Design a binder for this molecule. Structure first.
Ligand SMILES: *[C@@H]1O[C@H](CO)[C@@H](O[C@@H]2O[C@H](CO)[C@@H](O)[C@H](O)[C@H]2NC(C)=O)[C@H](O)[C@H]1NC(C)=O
Ligand SMILES: *[C@@H]1O[C@H](CO)[C@@H](O[C@@H]2O[C@H](CO)[C@@H](O)[C@H](O)[C@H]2NC(C)=O)[C@H](O)[C@H]1NC(C)=O
Ligand SMILES: *[C@@H]1O[C@H](CO)[C@@H](O[C@@H]2O[C@H](CO)[C@@H](O)[C@H](O)[C@H]2NC(C)=O)[C@H](O)[C@H]1NC(C)=O
Ligand SMILES: *[C@@H]1O[C@H](CO)[C@@H](O[C@@H]2O[C@H](CO)[C@@H](O)[C@H](O)[C@H]2NC(C)=O)[C@H](O)[C@H]1NC(C)=O
Ligand SMILES: *[C@@H]1O[C@H](CO)[C@@H](O[C@@H]2O[C@H](CO)[C@@H](O)[C@H](O)[C@H]2NC(C)=O)[C@H](O)[C@H]1NC(C)=O
Ligand code: NAG
Ligand code: NAG
Lengths: 99, 49, 50, 170, 50
């Protein structure tokens, strides 16, 4: 509705019998492959991200925000626990750090 | 051609005005397209037609 | 040729054969007066909406 | 072909030009409408050959390779259910290219989420895409993950009911 | 020629891989929308009859 991409803001400009909108939008770029999982299995419990997504660079598991790569250590502060590991299809085993 | 949307509206309105002005030159089956020529050439019974 | 308008001086270089002038609507816009052969411009009298 | 009729028609001026120009404007407006509706992507996406979407079935909406028109079964049913100086101009986009545009949109929204509509197509598994959509309507991801088989079965049953309702309602 | 619809792109879909952006582009685009026309009024009596 306000340009191509994720809309940030817009500027109006007057034109003869018209209006010109300068739509400032956010475009993602330089994407990278990662191996992802729906949940983390730890101590017989399933951990799900509060706002982000589990990614792996090959050996280590992290959680990052969805629209920008910013890897962080999977802790209890950014995950929530629901159920055991027997139900979620594709759950992987990884440690969950406790601050 | 960046500003073609406004120029399209301007061209359509100017072309409609030009067509409306051009339609005065047609007699539509009458002897002349000029009203003064008809009013100066004919009696009112046929100038009425 | 009948009509109403203000007759003013003009700067249109008519060729010898040329007598009058016509606009897009075909209404006469300039005329050459007989007897004196001068070229008179025909400008419609002022009008507008009240 | 009457020349006397055209000689009398020239007395009325440029009415025919106005009618032809209005119809030409309508004719290009239809192509502009189709261009604005269907051509919202400049990349023609394809689904992967393996249809492993975590139990979700899209065969009724993906194009059928056995059909020469490359239409979906639903689109094929939709196309089956619709039945002096005059000329009909053909549309600029044929039905095959409109079907190709819809196939590209379906492949983009299945394999890449809403990311292809805002930039480059970023691949994501479909049971994760669904969880993101669940979080968009305010339901936690765990609910989707725990009950993924039931949601896939409900989705497939609803798609089949859509095809049955379109085939059973005139 | 028969017009192409787009460049062909095959999305590398698999059931356990995701693509995450590592950078961004701030893109400014123009959108031109007409608002009004020229306000034209025609004296119907003067147009038909003068
Ligand atoms: C995945 O990311 C982690 C974290 O950045 C990497 O682990 C680090 O790797 C560097 C380079 O060998 C070491 O100097 C650090 O000591 C490592 N940190 C830890 C906590 O082990 C890991 O190498 C990355 N893996 C791949 C395949 O890129
Ligand atoms: C993830 O961890 C669980 C629990 O530590 C593993 O489940 C065990 O698997 C072994 C052999 O596969 C069994 O003998 C145990 O009885 C299982 N324990 C439970 C509690 O189920 C699971 O295999 C691990 N998965 C991976 C991929 O390493
Ligand atoms: C997805 O749905 C289609 C259609 O509902 C399934 O295709 C059916 O498969 C069964 C058994 O294989 C056949 O008896 C039906 O005739 C098929 N229907 C059609 C319309 O072809 C398909 O099996 C489902 N699953 C997958 C993985 O594609
Ligand atoms: C993520 O990985 C996939 C597969 O490993 C990459 O897809 C391949 O990309 C190359 C180069 O563009 C193509 O020649 C292959 O045909 C692609 N394979 C498939 C199955 O599509 C993809 O490019 C990777 N993504 C990134 C950002 O590097
Ligand atoms: C993200 O992208 C921006 C540009 O889109 C990169 O900034 C450029 O970096 C190169 C090398 O450092 C410079 O030569 C250019 O002058 C920079 N451009 C601008 C506009 O500043 C940036 O480095 C990228 N970051 C990452 C992490 O990839
Ligand atoms: C993904 O597919 C592979 C086979 O290609 C399978 O082994 C694996 O279990 C699947 N994972 C999920 C989460 O469906
Ligand atoms: C009379 O008109 C002719 C042209 O029609 C012109 O040459 C002549 O000078 C005019 N004479 C007078 C007295 O106006």
């Amino acid at each position: 509705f306000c340009g191509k991409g994720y809309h940030l803001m817009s500027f109006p400009q007057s034109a003869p019998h018209g209006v010109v909108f300068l739509h400032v939008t956010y475009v993602p770029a330089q994407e990278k492959n990662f191996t992802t999982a729906p949940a983390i299995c730890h101590d017989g419990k399933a951990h799900f991200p509060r706002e982000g997504v589990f990614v792996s660079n090959g050996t280590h598991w992290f959680v990052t925000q969805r629209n920008f790569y910013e890897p962080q250590i999977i802790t209890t502060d950014n995950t929530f626990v629901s159920g055991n590991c027997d139900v979620v299809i594709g759950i992987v085993n990884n440690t969950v750090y406790d601050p | 051609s960046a500003l073609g949307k406004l120029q399209d509206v301007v061209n359509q309105n100017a072309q409609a005005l030009n067509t409306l002005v051009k339609q005065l030159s047609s007699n539509f089956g009458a002897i002349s397209s000029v009203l003064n020529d008809i009013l100066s050439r004919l009696d009112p019974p046929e100038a009425e037609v | 040729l009948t009509g109403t308008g203000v007759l003013t001086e003009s700067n249109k270089k008519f060729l010898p054969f040329q007598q009058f002038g016509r606009d897009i609507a075909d209404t006469t816009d300039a005329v050459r007066d007989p007897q004196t052969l001068e070229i008179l411009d025909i400008t419609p009298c002022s009008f507008g909406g009240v | 072909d009457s020349t006397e009729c055209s000689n009398l028609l020239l007395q009325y001026g440029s009415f025919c030009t106005q009618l032809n120009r209005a119809l030409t404007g309508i004719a290009v407006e239809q192509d502009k409408n189709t261009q604005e509706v269907f051509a919202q992507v400049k990349q023609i996406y394809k689904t992967p050959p393996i249809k492993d979407f975590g139990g979700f079935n899209f065969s009724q909406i993906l194009p059928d390779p056995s059909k020469p028109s490359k239409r979906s079964p639903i689109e094929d049913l939709l196309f089956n259910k619709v039945t002096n100086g005059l000329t009909v101009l053909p549309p600029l986009l044929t039905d095959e290219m409109i079907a190709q545009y819809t196939s590209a949109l379906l492949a983009g929204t299945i394999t890449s989420g809403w990311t292809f509509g805002a930039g480059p197509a970023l691949q994501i598994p479909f049971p994760m895409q669904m969880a993101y959509r669940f979080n968009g309507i305010g339901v936690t991801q765990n609910v989707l993950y725990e009950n993924q088989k039931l949601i896939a079965n409900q989705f497939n049953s609803a798609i089949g009911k859509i095809q049955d309702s379109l085939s059973s309602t005139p | 020629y028969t017009m192409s619809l787009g460049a062909e792109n095959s999305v590398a879909y698999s059931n356990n891989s995701i693509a995450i952006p590592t950078n961004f582009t701030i893109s400014v685009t123009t959108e031109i929308l007409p608002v009004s026309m020229t306000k034209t009024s025609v004296d119907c009596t003067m147009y038909i009859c003068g």
